[PDB]
Amino acid sequence: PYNKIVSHLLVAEPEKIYAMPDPTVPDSDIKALTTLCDLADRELVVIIGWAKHIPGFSTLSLADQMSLLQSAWMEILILGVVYRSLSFEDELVYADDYIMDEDQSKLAGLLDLNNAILQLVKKYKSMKLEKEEFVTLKAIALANSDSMHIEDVEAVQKLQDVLHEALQDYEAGQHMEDPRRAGKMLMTLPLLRQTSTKAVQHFYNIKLEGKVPMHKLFLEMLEAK
Amino acid sequence: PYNKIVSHLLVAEPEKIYAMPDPTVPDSDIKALTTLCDLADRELVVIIGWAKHIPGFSTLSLADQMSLLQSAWMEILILGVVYRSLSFEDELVYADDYIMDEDQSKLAGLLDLNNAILQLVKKYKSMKLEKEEFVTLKAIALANSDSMHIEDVEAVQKLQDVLHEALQDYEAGQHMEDPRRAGKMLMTLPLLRQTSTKAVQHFYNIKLEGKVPMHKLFLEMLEAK
Amino acid sequence: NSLLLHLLKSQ
Amino acid sequence: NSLLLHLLKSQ
Ligand SMILES: O=[N+]([O-])c1ccc2cc[nH]c2c1
Ligand SMILES: O=[N+]([O-])c1ccc2cc[nH]c2c1
């Protein structure tokens, strides 16, 4: 029975979407990446919707709303994979119908990116990350996304402050045994940022190599980096 | 009159070193990068010495000591440039005798890297970063460096905890007016990580391009990434 | 003009 | 063997 912003982000959390890899297409690197880029395109729509439930996000200018999402979108996608993967060992749950082990990662050419995502999984598993913390960190990653293009720096700082205050209140209430738990959660964000950079670089390379079709929204978010 | 670990890191802070660009060599991209890589080689020696004053660092295995420094060395170099640059506008103080403006950054091919370093400067300027916070964040960046190669995960977590506790105690004592200041400082670490990745990538590219001579220690730290 | 903007203005 | 190790063992 905790912080109201945390409560709200929990009920704002979107429903899972399925990858639905085309069962008429033969299994290949191109099929795996096409499947993952299609899933990312669809999850970006859901993410834009979610961001509007984040208290105060909708009061920013449309330019600032776009700036935060263009900076943070891959971090938010990664955190979803991470959260879904916490009850697994050495597997990434991209979706309930798309669980990637080492074998599938090698076949997709994603072994290095997927190993970095697994390092995030193993850290949050050792901290026993709760859904409450997951949704709060997702929002903080959006607010703290270091865009060079913000118009109202004070308004974005205020959003950062509101969500950080929510995280601190939740940990103070729920995790009295570890007075440093909120800071330990914030100290996971550098590896999240690092992994997002590697993922965006990787998918940018795939876009240039021209062999994997990609939807308009995914390509626009990739172009913005 | 504050936290003893902070006090200790302050008196452990190494003396400035000069870049001493060779005055017999004509100004070029190769001279600038040779000067910066030589300065980095020399600062890495100073950094290894400093790390030994960090309470508990010397009790880790030699393997774990090396693992933390191989992961964090560029973040520590960047934080030094950032701190020296806080009283300047749009200039990076690599050393008292090596201050880079836009013009010099373009000539070195460093415009993009130096713009990212300047974003860190402008954030810490807006927070009025103190030397106490700077040395504490430097130590936290070393302890929180996300090496995949640690032997004693619990011992490194314990070091992370000691330094995080120092930061929280210092802000509680010195910055009563902002109960979120310690977390705001921790929320600067993702941009530091991002900038370190860009810097290491850039200098790795220079190493492969084969035109800039580099010293043994700098090349070894670059190889470890 | 951007689909991101479109979706931010939508419903 | 590594100069990093050497300098970590030194003085
Ligand atoms: O690179 N990623 O971490 C990544 C790539 C694609 C998707 C699709 C859904 N979540 C994703 C995450
Ligand atoms: O890429 N850097 O930020 C960088 C590069 C070189 C040096 C030398 C001293 N500090 C440095 C920082």
mmCIF file of N, CA, C and O and ligand atoms in Angstrom, chain B residues 36-37 39-40 43 74 77-78 81 84 94 113-114 117 199 203 218, ligand 2:
data_model
loop_
_atom_site.group_PDB
_atom_site.id
_atom_site.type_symbol
_atom_site.label_atom_id
_atom_site.label_comp_id
_atom_site.label_asym_id
_atom_site.label_seq_id
_atom_site.Cartn_x
_atom_site.Cartn_y
_atom_site.Cartn_z
ATOM 1 N N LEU B 36 46.818 14.188 -26.716
ATOM 2 C CA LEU B 36 45.708 13.653 -25.870
ATOM 3 C C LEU B 36 45.959 12.203 -25.458
ATOM 4 O O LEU B 36 45.697 11.904 -24.289
ATOM 5 N N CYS B 37 46.440 11.334 -26.352
ATOM 6 C CA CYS B 37 46.733 9.922 -25.990
ATOM 7 C C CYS B 37 47.907 9.853 -25.024
ATOM 8 O O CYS B 37 47.834 9.037 -24.105
ATOM 9 N N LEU B 39 48.747 12.228 -22.884
ATOM 10 C CA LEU B 39 48.204 12.762 -21.614
ATOM 11 C C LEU B 39 47.368 11.674 -20.916
ATOM 12 O O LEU B 39 47.540 11.476 -19.679
ATOM 13 N N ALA B 40 46.497 10.998 -21.667
ATOM 14 C CA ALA B 40 45.711 9.849 -21.151
ATOM 15 C C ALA B 40 46.628 8.736 -20.606
ATOM 16 O O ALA B 40 46.337 8.221 -19.499
ATOM 17 N N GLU B 43 47.892 10.003 -17.302
ATOM 18 C CA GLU B 43 46.810 10.129 -16.306
ATOM 19 C C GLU B 43 46.380 8.714 -15.837
ATOM 20 O O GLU B 43 46.046 8.593 -14.671
ATOM 21 N N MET B 74 37.965 5.248 -18.813
ATOM 22 C CA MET B 74 37.637 6.402 -19.705
ATOM 23 C C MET B 74 36.621 7.282 -18.984
ATOM 24 O O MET B 74 36.724 8.528 -19.075
ATOM 25 N N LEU B 77 38.671 9.479 -16.737
ATOM 26 C CA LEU B 77 39.378 10.534 -17.521
ATOM 27 C C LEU B 77 38.375 11.616 -17.872
ATOM 28 O O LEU B 77 38.663 12.777 -17.620
ATOM 29 N N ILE B 78 37.186 11.217 -18.332
ATOM 30 C CA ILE B 78 36.136 12.193 -18.757
ATOM 31 C C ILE B 78 35.718 13.059 -17.573
ATOM 32 O O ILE B 78 35.614 14.275 -17.718
ATOM 33 N N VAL B 81 38.177 15.904 -16.959
ATOM 34 C CA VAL B 81 38.015 16.996 -17.970
ATOM 35 C C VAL B 81 36.782 17.800 -17.571
ATOM 36 O O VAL B 81 36.830 19.073 -17.466
ATOM 37 N N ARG B 84 37.379 20.087 -14.438
ATOM 38 C CA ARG B 84 38.306 21.208 -14.760
ATOM 39 C C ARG B 84 37.600 22.256 -15.618
ATOM 40 O O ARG B 84 38.058 23.427 -15.621
ATOM 41 N N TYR B 94 41.396 19.917 -20.920
ATOM 42 C CA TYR B 94 42.085 18.616 -20.839
ATOM 43 C C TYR B 94 43.231 18.749 -19.822
ATOM 44 O O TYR B 94 43.479 17.854 -19.018
ATOM 45 N N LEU B 113 32.508 14.059 -30.052
ATOM 46 C CA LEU B 113 32.913 13.603 -28.691
ATOM 47 C C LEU B 113 32.943 14.805 -27.746
ATOM 48 O O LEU B 113 32.363 14.705 -26.678
ATOM 49 N N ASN B 114 33.578 15.919 -28.130
ATOM 50 C CA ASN B 114 33.724 17.112 -27.265
ATOM 51 C C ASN B 114 32.360 17.760 -27.011
ATOM 52 O O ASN B 114 32.141 18.262 -25.891
ATOM 53 N N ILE B 117 30.873 15.682 -24.228
ATOM 54 C CA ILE B 117 31.567 15.975 -22.944
ATOM 55 C C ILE B 117 31.019 17.310 -22.434
ATOM 56 O O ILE B 117 30.707 17.435 -21.249
ATOM 57 N N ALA B 199 33.847 7.768 -26.596
ATOM 58 C CA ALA B 199 35.280 8.145 -26.555
ATOM 59 C C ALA B 199 36.150 6.915 -26.850
ATOM 60 O O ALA B 199 37.111 7.012 -27.622
ATOM 61 N N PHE B 203 38.714 6.483 -30.047
ATOM 62 C CA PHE B 203 40.160 6.217 -29.881
ATOM 63 C C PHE B 203 40.515 4.821 -30.385
ATOM 64 O O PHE B 203 41.677 4.656 -30.848
ATOM 65 N N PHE B 218 48.030 2.951 -22.352
ATOM 66 C CA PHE B 218 46.835 3.433 -23.088
ATOM 67 C C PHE B 218 46.344 2.336 -24.030
ATOM 68 O O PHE B 218 45.128 2.043 -24.007
HETATM 69 O O1 LIG E 2 38.184 11.106 -24.539
HETATM 70 N N1 LIG E 2 38.409 11.762 -23.473
HETATM 71 O O2 LIG E 2 37.407 12.320 -22.755
HETATM 72 C C1 LIG E 2 39.696 11.973 -23.094
HETATM 73 C C2 LIG E 2 40.797 11.734 -23.986
HETATM 74 C C3 LIG E 2 42.068 11.997 -23.527
HETATM 75 C C4 LIG E 2 42.245 12.473 -22.292
HETATM 76 C C5 LIG E 2 43.369 12.814 -21.634
HETATM 77 C C6 LIG E 2 43.038 13.255 -20.405
HETATM 78 N N2 LIG E 2 41.696 13.183 -20.271
HETATM 79 C C7 LIG E 2 41.201 12.703 -21.442
HETATM 80 C C8 LIG E 2 39.951 12.464 -21.827
#
